[PDB]
Amino acid sequence: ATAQQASGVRATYNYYNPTQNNWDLAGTYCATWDAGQPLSWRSKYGWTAFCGPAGPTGQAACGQCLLVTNTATGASLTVRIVDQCSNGGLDLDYDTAFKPLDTNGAGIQAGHLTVNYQFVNCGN
Structure with missing residues (x-):
């Protein structure tokens, strides 16, 4: 079957700042399973927490990849799930992730983006 996807969910931003910290997963929920991965894996894609209404979540989602589309501009980006969030x-x-997707700057003015997402092969 097709990989899971959802349309029109809210994306906020968090300052994980993996490039200021050697892409270290310590402190994220997925560190339990994924912190030992090589730098090439940890830094392949920008990071997100995930809690969408379609697809695996929590432990089963750790390390999976999403193609995320900013519905306000058409920009898209692949990101890696490194954490879980408490919404939808x-x-x-x-x-x-948020800054490269926010290609007209409206997202930081509103505090969020409206995005679509689909699970995709990470190509690891």
Whole structure:
């Protein structure tokens, strides 16, 4: 079957700042399973927390990849799930995911983006 997807969910941002910290997963929920991965894996894609209404979540979602589309502009980006959030959307790392998706700057004025997402092959 097709990989899971949802449309029109909210994406906020969080300052994980993996590039200021050697892409270290310590402190994220997924560190339990994924912190030992090589730098090439940890830094392949920008980071997000995930809690969408379609697809695996929590432990089963750790390390999976999402193609995220900003519905206000058409920008898209692949991100890696490194954490879980407590709503029904995404909490994108600001530096490595929210900022590159916010191509007209409206997202930081509103405090969020409206995005679609689909699970995709990470190509690891």
